């Protein structure tokens, strides 16, 4: 409603570039986060497939202490694991051979 055709383009064009650049930045940052959110989601799938369906002999992966089993729980946009572990508590010492 303000500018005529020969001179309105010189103003909308730089508005076009800035709005397009903002969209490009948002999509690019989403790519890094989407790759990162899948990195943990692959870990969650691996943890779900091994802590829950079996007893992992690897230490510190399925909780803290000697791991016994796990119980999965849902959550908004995520998952929660209840790692049931066995840890020693009472330690009398002895002389060995």
């Amino acid at each position: 409603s303000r500018l005529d055709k020969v001179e309105a383009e010189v103003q909308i064009d730089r508005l076009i570039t800035g709005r397009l650049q903002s969209l490009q930045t948002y999509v690019t940052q989403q790519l890094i986060r989407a790759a990162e959110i899948r990195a943990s989601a692959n870990l969650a799938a691996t943890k779900m497939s091994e802590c829950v369906l079996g007893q992992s002999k690897r230490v510190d992966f399925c909780g803290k202490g000697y791991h016994l089993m796990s119980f999965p729980q849902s959550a908004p946009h995520g998952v929660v694991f209840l790692h049931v572990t066995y840890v020693p508590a009472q330690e009398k010492n002895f002389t060995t051979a």
């Binding site: 959110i37 803290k64 998952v79 929660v80 049931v84 060995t96």
Partner: peptide, 25 residues
């Protein structure tokens, strides 16, 4: 020649929160 062997356990339960997905746009 000294060793320490446990005589009792403690079955603890710990959480672990891992994100899985984000909102689609």
């Amino acid at each position: 020649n000294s060793i320490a062997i446990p005589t009792n356990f403690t079955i603890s339960v710990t959480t672990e929160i891992l994100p899985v997905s984000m909102t689609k746009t």
